[PDB]
């Protein structure tokens, strides 16, 4: 039932987050998703007063769609490099289906609703990364 939401520049560690997320015996299914930056540095601009709230609104909606246990959502900001972990979603449930589906949903909605914008520091200047129509479609299925 508790939700951990963190938005900030600091790195996170899946091994550090997992124990808490997985602690409840009634939370028999634990799914995590880590997304890394996909060589140019990326800088993640964000709307600070909204990013945590938006992530929390997505988890609240997930909790109404699936019976979830602990959930953790972490999204980094600042300058990151390919290979760096940018986002972590941890979800638990009694059954795997709920856990997987909610993880997918949380990611799909994060990718279309959480106010972060990536810019790439290319040789010719900063360039904004393009939003993907595939994220829109993925989100629209829910």
């Amino acid at each position: 039932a508790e939700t951990k939401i963190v938005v900030g520049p600091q790195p996170f560690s899946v091994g550090e987050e997992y124990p808490w997320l997985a602690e409840r015996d009634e939370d028999g299914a634990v799914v995590t998703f880590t997304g890394k930056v996909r060589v140019n540095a990326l800088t993640l601009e964000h709307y600070p007063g909204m990013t945590e709230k938006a992530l929390a609104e997505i988890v609240d909606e997930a909790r109404n769609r699936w019976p979830l246990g602990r959930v953790t959502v972490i999204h980094r900001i600042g300058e990151l490099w390919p290979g760096d972990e940018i986002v972590f979603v941890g979800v638990t449930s009694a059954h795997r289906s709920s856990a997987f589906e909610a993880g997918q949903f949380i990611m799909d909605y994060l990718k279309t609703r959480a106010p972060f914008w990536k810019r790439e520091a290319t040789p010719e200047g900063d360039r904004w990364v393009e939003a993907r129509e595939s994220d829109q479609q993925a989100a629209k299925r829910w």
């Binding site: 709307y47 007063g49 909204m50 709230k53 609703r113 106010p115 939003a131 829109q136």
Partner: protein, 81 residues
């Protein structure tokens, strides 16, 4: 007043991060149109069919009503991780 925040490309094109407007608009849309009408740059920034809006840090329809003290933000489609 209503505080209007801009992000990313929108911010870049409008040329400010934030501004205040009187609460004389019934909806986000009415406000968007008023801001768009201030200049060609503002219209460009704030006329994209994919522009998003938030009111008090929630994403909303452009038909969302506005009220004094609200914080409105206009921004492009998001690109987080």
């Amino acid at each position: 007043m209503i505080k209007v925040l801009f992000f990313a490309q929108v911010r870049e094109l409008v040329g400010t991060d934030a501004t205040e407007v009187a609460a004389d608009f019934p909806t986000v849309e009415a406000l968007r149109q008023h801001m768009a009408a201030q200049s060609d740059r503002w219209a460009l920034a704030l006329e994209d069919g994919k522009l998003l809006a938030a009111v008090n840090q929630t994403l909303v329809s452009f038909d969302h009503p506005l009220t004094d003290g609200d914080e409105v933000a206009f921004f492009p489609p998001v690109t987080g991780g």
